[PDB]
Structures are given as structure tokens and as C-alpha cells.
């Protein structure tokens, strides 16, 4: 028809792919993803067309509001008797005459009672019903639902800013009238043995191809649950470089039915020189996506070895075969049994599960030998029931001891009373048993839900398993906020690696979730669209895409303006440090500028929302206020007017750094844990503000940073006006009288807060041109190069001037750093598993948990509270 072929046209440019491109994928699971995820979409869909016109408002704008109603003591003493003042804005005749009217109300107000008091207070000057809305003057932020004022961020962020809130009033009607009338359309694409297997596991290596010139070479391969070993690892016999051909059966020490659900294979193809060497790895999930047991002759073509990688083995990277056939291609063979073997429905494993609890009942009683895995019964003293509460106050990284497991697993019903230890338990769990596997399946069937930045653990790739997993998406899927979600966004979309198929409870969740939310929807985009370059997740994450783009609304012709702009500014920075490197300044502004004459590049950009915050709409490029940076990678700073019609009350230009060069995951993820930490810190009621300024990541080593305006590096305050002195006259002439005193206080509050997050964080090495001021005091580091590889942040003169080492402002400073410290100690497990969940994506500095023990290290982890406050009270001393 008409509009499936403008459907998959526009669909094709957000992903870069056609869509026609995944039809001529002969993979059945890859056709069965396409097909069955539709219900997803169409649940969705249903979901924006149950309370229609309303309901499809809220998904274009959802309420940009806190997890929490409650405010802490902090900012409610910021409020003159509870109440906020606020000014409502009405757009009046054609002349478009902007009237403010000033409001002091509850700051718990509902936005149809403050519309209620704004009509009242209208009516008043002088001497209308529920058919109004609330706007956020400047962006397109709506105060669409029934949460208390307070609750909405912008509100929140005025109170603690001391800012006033400046909102629009608009009719209900004239909001409709802007939303188009969609229509989801369906596509085209649409329309055994058991455990019965009494014998052990052995592959064939039958022969290698595409591999050939650079002393002898084999075949290293391992059964793997995770990155944990199922067995030990099998070798092939080593064989003469050119000739790669072993025909040799390889024993492992399993017996078929002891294979978990997400046991996969493991191998690569090694070098001897002795000194031992990756050529190429590749991993096969034992089962498919239909539960089948794979059986037969099979070839799989190899990755090549990532940078950093440690064994001869890549167990946590991804699993199947690379899609350039042209690659070194292994010949496998697995055993073919009576016909096709599936791994059991779960009321089999369910009477298997009856069964071996009671053949473990009976076992001992009647055993003669000893066990430690053996669950006895009512011997449970208090001394072992203080020793497993402790286990599960362990953080994620500590050990946990053979001796650890076997208790654990022997105390494994009583467990079920400590639900957070769940992580420890399945742990203990030997996996290479379906004896312990089948039971501990029935525990999870059954088990408490937990906190869900407690069941993000159980999604890393030490959590292998499908109940495991579903258990943990189940948890989000009740207790995790759509603001929570949106914090958390980079690492559950990583996690989305660690799956061992297309089709999954995680990638269903996130999808409903990003199909009902268009703010969730823009980043899961994103977060998506800027890994299409690599091979290892194009499929994947273009399949996941399709699906986005194919339900998504209106939105996706918003996403193409966008998909076009950036391409527009790779292509235009490409040639100007290619063809137009040595060339000035001046000469390569020209070039722009008769580039910007062009019809596809004045509409390209122009007229589109920003990647960074959609909210955001960028109308005319200002050629004017933009520029050719001076840095290495050629950055373009670029300056749009701000379309708004009050854009006057927010910021009458947007400016956004475009950075074509620089690896920016670093940055994105240094800056979201900088968001957290400052939410901690608010939330536990200590004003530590910080400024996680945006920055995404669009591909690679593309992408987009905020501009911080009024804001000057500490070198250039030393510089105009060596000398150490300038940093607290600057502040005092930027902030003279009465307005200093709350400048000098911002300056602490906010250093305070970068020592401990650089401390804890081991960001690399802070100058004078790394840590930036605001003309109101308040500081903030950038270009986060290298972390957790010490005290960077050293607070020099400059900074302790400002501040007040023997001062009563300097204790009180000092009183700031410890309550941040300890409050990021007792949040550790959190920060732990952001960065645990992010050890899929390729970042250098992040390709090992030990890279991640650092955390351990600088929060005293194996230490007390106590221990640890002398700890960071030693390391401030030595400056």
C-alpha cells in the first residue's frame, strides 16, 4: 500500500538500514522477533488510544516529575510558610500581548487548582473551567497530570535555584489541535526428548577456514553459565598455521541433562609462538530461542579479539556468528540424539524440583557420607542467622567464599526471610546441577520482590539465567518510576547485550515502556541509534529499533529531522579536518556558510528538537553566534533561536557543542553518576549542587554537549585582571553587597561536592582549564578524560580563599565533604552495579570488574563507617 511504503521509507532512515534489508534474513529467530514483539507495540498503541485526546498528550509530554511527593526539610524551608510564588503567563488578542499574573499558593497545588486561583486573580484586575493547561515558559514541558507542583522538576529545581516559575496557560483544545491523528498499521512480514538424555557433552572441531598466514595454532573452548566455567576447558590439538583441520571430538566433564537453560559455548582460535594469543573468539548458546538443544553440523564465523581482553576466551562478549562471512569460520559438530532434544517445560522441572527436595529429604537421614549442601532442617542457630544477614550486607564485588556457598545453598529456604541476599544465593547455586538448578527455579517462582537498584544486579552477565532475569524485570516492572527508569536508561539498555536472545522480558519491558513515554522513547532511540555502527549489536539493536520506529507515532518524523541534522554536521566536520584542516578559520567559516545557502542544509539545520532535551526546539541557526572551535577534533558551537514564544523567560538562544572525534561514553556516564550522587545528596537533605550538564553520545565518537553559559575556566579568571590571588576578587566584584554571602556559599557547597565526587570517581588530572565558575559562584568540572585511574581535585589557595584551614567556614566545609562521602558509602551498591551493567559497552577503562574494584578501594568497603571517615579524613590531608 501507500502507507507502509512511506512507513518503512521514513523507518529506514531513522535506523540507516532498510527495512527491506531485514526481510532477506534467513534466521528464524530474527522473523519471529519482527512478528511477535507487535503486541507489544499494539498494547502500547492502545494504551495512548484508551483516553484519547488525553491519554495521547500524556505520551507526547509526560509529566517531568520527581519519584517522590515529599520534599526534604531543605528545600521546604526555602518556601516562605510553605507557600511558592509563581507567576502565570496568558498570550492575549492577536497582538499577542503577554500578561503575567503573580500567584503565592501551596506548593503541594494541584495545576488545576493553580489555573483555579490564576482565573480568579484574571478575573480581579478588572475591578472559565477545567479547559486549561499548564506550560513551562521556553520548551515544551506540559503539567498534564494531578501531581502536587512541587513533585513537577522544574518547579522543585526553582525552589532550590530561588528562581520563579514562569508558566504559560494555554486551552486544553489548542494542545489537541497540535497532536496529529495516527494509526498503527500492521506490516507485511506478519502474514522431542527431554532430560531423558543418559549421556555427557562433546563437540566436534571439525576445521577452520579464512585462516592462514603469520608457530601452531588451536582451539580453546569452555562450557560457560556467564562468564563462569560449567566445567574445565577443553583444547584442540595444536595444528601447523595454513592447514587448519582438527576432526577432533572434544569431552567435557557435564552430562547433557546438567546443562543450565543459558549454558553457551565458549571458544576461539589461539596462537603459540609459550606465549599464547587470541586470533578470533565466538560463543553459541547450547539452546536456541525455541528452548532446542543444538544438534549437527554447524559453522560459525569468529569476532575479531577486543582491545584489553585478558584470557584466551571472550565468555561475556556476544554470542553468534559474525555477519561478515569473509571472516576466520569454524566447523562444529554436535551430537544428534532420538529426535529434537528441548529443554524441559516448567511443570517438568517443577516435579523434578518436588522430587529432588524429597530425595534430598531421604538422601540424609540415610546418606552415611557427609554434605555441606545438604538443606538440614530447624538446625539454624541465632550466631548462622547473624552470619547470613551479614553475607547479604556484603556489596556485590566482596568474595564469597566455597565454604560461603555451600552455607547459602544449605540455608536456602530460610534465605527466602532475607530477600536482598537473592544475588549471594544464586551465586551458591552449582549450575551444573538441574537438581540445585530445578529448586532454586521454585524459589524464585516465590520469591519477595526486591528494590529495583537491587534487581539491576541480577542483570548484569553474572546473571545469566531467564528466571533470574525475568524475576528482575519483573521487579521493575511493579516498583520502577519512569523517572527512575530515565536515570538509569544507558545501563539497562547495555544489559540488553548480555541476553542471550532478540526475544527477552527486558527488551519487552523497555519497549512498552519507551512506546507509552516519548521522553523514554527519544533516548531509548538514541541510546540505540549511537551503536549501529558496531557489528556486535547492529542487528539486534536495529531489529529493537524497527519496532521502535514502526509504533512510535508522529515522533518518528521528528527523530528523521534530527537523524538529518546529524548526519549534516559528520559530513560537515569530516571535510573540515580532511580537506580543510590547515585551512584558516576564516577560509573554513566561508565554506560553511556557502554550505548553509544550500536548500538540504538550511532545512536539515534548522527546525528540529534537540537530541539533548526535546523539550527543546531549535528554530533558525544563528551563523553568527556560531563557530569553528579552537580544539584538535574541529568542534562547532552551534547557536539556534529558541522558537518559543516566551522564550524571553528561559533562554532566547539554545547553544550546543557538536563534537565530531572524541569517544564520548566517558563523559555521558561520568555525568549521570554526578546526577545521582547530587540526588543522593538532596535527597539525605545536603544542598551539594552540582551540574550534570548534558552530553550523548550519537555514534562513534560523535556527539552533542551543553553549553554552560556565564560560565569561565579558573586559568582564564587568573589570567586577565602566574598570580594566585584573582579567584575570590572575581566573585566579590561579580557578586557585590548583600548578593555575595549566598555567592561565597554556593561556591562551597557545589567544591564540596566535586572533591568527593573526583575522590571517589578517580577522575583524571584537574587544572585550571578542567574546573570551571558561574558569575554566581557556582563551580563544575568538564571533560571527564579517565576514571577510577589519589586526589585530583587539589584544593588549592585560590579555592580555600574563596571558601573563607583554620577558619570556622573551613570546618564547615570539611563537616559538607564528610556527610557527602558517607552518604555515597551507604549508596555503593548502586554505584557498583551503573558500573558493572556497563562492562558490555566498549569502554577502555571499563573492560573488567577489577577496573570497577576501585570504587572498593576509595569507599572503604572491607573497613566501618568509622574506619572510612578516617580514611578519606587522611587522603583530604595529603595535598
Known amino acids: 500500500n501507500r502507507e507502509e511504503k512511506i512507513l518503512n521509507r521514513e523507518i529506514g532512515f531513522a535506523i540507516g538500514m532498510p527495512v527491506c534489508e531485514f526481510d532477506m534474513v534467513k534466521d528464524p529467530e530474527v522473523q519471529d522477533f519482527r512478528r511477535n514483539i507487535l503486541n507489544v507495540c499494539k498494547e502500547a498503541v492502545d494504551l495512548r488510544d484508551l483516553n484519547s485526546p488525553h491519554s495521547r498528550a500524556m505520551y507526547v509530554y509526560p509529566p517531568n516529575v520527581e519519584s517522590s511527593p515529599e520534599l526534604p526539610k531543605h528545600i521546604y524551608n526555602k518556601l516562605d510558610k510553605g507557600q511558592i510564588i509563581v507567576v502565570i503567563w496568558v498570550i492575549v488578542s492577536p ?18 487548582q493553580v489555573i483555579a486561583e490564576a482565573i480568579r486573580k ?6 472559565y473551567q477545567g479547559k486549561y493547561i499548564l506550560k513551562v515558559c521556553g520548551c515544551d514541558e506540559y503539567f498534564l497530570e494531578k501531581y502536587p507542583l512541587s513533585q513537577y522538576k522544574y518547579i522543585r529545581s526553582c525552589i532550590m535555584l530561588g528562581r520563579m516559575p514562569n508558566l504559560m496557560l494555554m486551552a486544553k483544545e489548542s494542545l489537541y489541535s497540535q497532536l496529529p491523528m495516527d494509526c498503527f498499521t500492521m506490516p507485511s512480514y506478519s502474514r522431542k526428548s527431554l532430560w531423558v538424555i543418559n549421556s555427557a557433552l562433546r563437540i566436534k572441531i571439525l576445521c577452520a577456514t579464512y585462516v592462514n598466514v603469520n608457530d601452531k595454532i588451536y582451539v580453546r573452548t569452555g562450557i560457560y ?3 563462569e566455567p560449567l566445567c574445565d576447558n577443553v583444547n584442540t590439538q595444536r595444528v601447523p598455521c595454513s592447514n587448519p583441520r582438527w576432526n577432533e571430538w572434544l569431552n567435557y566433564d557435564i552430562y547433557i541433562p546438567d546443562l543450565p537453560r543459558a549454558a553457551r559455548l565458549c571458544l576461539s582460535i589461539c596462537s603459540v609462538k609459550e606465549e599464547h594469543c587470541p586470533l578470533a573468539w565466538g560463543n553459541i548458546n547450547l539452546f536456541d530461542y525455541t528452548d532446542t538443544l543444538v544438534s549437527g553440523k554447524m559453522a560459525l564465523n569468529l569476532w575479531p579479539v577486543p582491545h584489553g581482553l585478558e584470557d584466551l576466551l571472550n565468555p561475556i562478549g556476544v554470542t553468534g556468528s559474525n555477519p561478515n562471512k569473509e571472516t576466520p569460520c569454524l566447523e562444529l559438530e554436535f551430537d544428534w540424539f532420538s529426535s529434537v532434544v528441548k529443554f524441559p517445560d516448567m511443570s517438568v522441572i517443577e516435579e523434578h524440583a518436588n522430587w529432588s527436595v524429597s530425595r534430598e529429604a531421604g538422601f540424609s537421614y540415610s546418606h552415611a557420607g557427609l554434605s555441606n549442601r545438604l538443606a538440614r532442617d530447624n538446625e539454624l542457630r541465632e550466631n548462622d542467622k547473624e552470619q547470613l544477614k551479614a553475607i547479604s550486607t556484603r556489596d556485590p564485588l566482596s568474595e564469597i567464599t566455597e565454604q560461603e556457598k555451600d552455607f547459602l545453598w544449605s540455608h536456602r529456604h530460610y534465605c527466602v526471610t532475607i530477600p536482598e541476599i537473592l544475588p549471594k544465593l544464586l551465586l551458591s547455586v552449582k549450575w551444573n546441577s538441574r537438581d540445585e538448578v530445578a529448586q532454586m527455579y521454585c524459589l524464585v517462582k516465590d520469591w519477595p520482590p526486591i528494590k529495583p537498584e537491587q534487581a539491576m544486579e541480577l542483570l548484569d552477565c553474572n546473571y545469566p539465567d531467564p528466571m533470574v532475569r525475568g524475576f528482575a524485570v519483573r521487579c521493575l516492572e511493579k516498583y520502577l518510576t519512569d523517572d527512575k527508569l530515565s536515570q538509569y536508561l544507558i545501563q539497562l539498555v547495555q544489559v540488553l547485550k548480555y541476553e542471550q536472545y532478540l526475544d527477552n522480558l527486558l527488551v519487552r519491558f523497555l519497549l512498552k515502556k519507551a512506546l507509552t513515554n516519548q521522553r523514554i522513547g527519544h533516548f531509548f532511540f538514541w541510546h540505540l541509534k549511537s551503536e549501529m555502527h558496531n557489528k556486535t549489536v547492529s542487528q539486534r539493536f536495529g531489529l529493537l529499533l524497527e519496532s521502535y520506529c514502526r509504533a512510535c507515532g508522529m515522533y518518528l518524523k521528528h527523530l528523521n529531522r534530527q537523524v538529518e541534522a546529524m548526519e549534516k554536521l559528520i559530513n560537515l566536520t569530516d571535510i573540515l579536518k580532511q580537506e580543510k584542516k590547515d585551512e584558516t578559520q576564516k577560509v573554513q567559516m566561508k565554506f560553511l556558510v556557502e554550505q548553509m545557502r544550500r536548500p538540504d542544509f538550511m532545512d536539515a539545520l534548522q527546525g528540529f528538537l534537540s537530541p539533548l532535551n526535546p523539550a527543546h526546539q531549535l528554530g533558525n541557526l544563528r551563523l553568527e553566534e556560531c563557530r569553528i572551535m579552537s580544539s584538535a577534533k574541529r568542534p562547532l558551537w552551534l547557536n539556534w533561536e529558541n522558537p518559543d514564544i516566551m522564550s524571553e523567560l528561559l533562554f532566547q538562544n539554545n547553544e550546543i557543542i557538536f ?7 566517558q563523559d555521558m556516564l561520568t555525568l549521570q553518576i554526578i546526577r545521582i550522587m547530587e540526588n543522593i545528596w538532596q535527597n539525605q537533605g545536603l544542598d551539594l549542587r552540582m551540574l550534570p550538564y548534558g552530553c550523548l553520545s550519537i555514534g562513534d565518537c560523535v556527539g552533542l554537549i551543553e553549553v554552560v553559559r556565564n560560565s569561565h575556566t579558573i586559568m582564564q579568571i587568573q589570567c586577565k585582571g602566574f598570580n594566585s590571588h584573582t579567584l575570590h576578587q572575581w566573585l566579590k566584584d561579580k557578586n557585590k553587597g548583600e548578593i555575595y554571602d549566598a555567592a561565597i ?3 562551597t557547597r557545589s567544591c564540596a561536592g566535586y572533591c568527593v565526587a573526583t575522590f571517589i570517581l578517580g577522575i583524571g588530572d584537574r587544572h585550571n582549564s578542567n574546573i570551571m565558575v558561574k558569575d554566581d559562584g557556582q563551580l563544575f568540572h568538564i571533560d571527564f578524560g579517565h576514571f577510577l585511574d589519589r586526589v585530583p581535585f587539589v584544593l588549592t589557595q585560590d579555592f580555600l580563599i574563596v571558601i573563607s584551614t583554620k577558619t570556622r567556614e573551613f570546618e564547615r566545609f570539611q563537616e559538607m565533604c564528610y556527610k557527602a562521602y558517607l552518604a555515597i558509602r551507604q549508596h555503593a551498591n548502586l554505584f557498583i552495579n551503573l558500573f558493572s551493567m556497563m562492562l558490555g559497552s ?10 570497577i574494584a576501585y570504587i572498593r578501594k576509595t569507599l572503604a568497603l572491607d573497613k566501618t563507617e568509622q574506619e572510612a571517615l578516617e580514611y578519606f579524613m587522611k587522603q583530604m590531608n595529603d595535598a
Open 225 to 227: 553459565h556467564g562468564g
Open 745 to 747: 556559599d554556593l561556591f
Open 95 to 112: 497582538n499577542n500581548d503577554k500578561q503575567k499574573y503573580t500567584l503565592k499558593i501551596n506548593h503541594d497545588c494541584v495545576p488545576e
Open 122 to 127: 484574571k478575573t480581579r484586575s478588572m475591578l
Open 659 to 665: 563534537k565530531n572525534g572524541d569517544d564520548l561514553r
Open 842 to 851: 566498549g569502554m577502555p577503562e571499563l573492560q573488567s570488574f577489577d577496573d
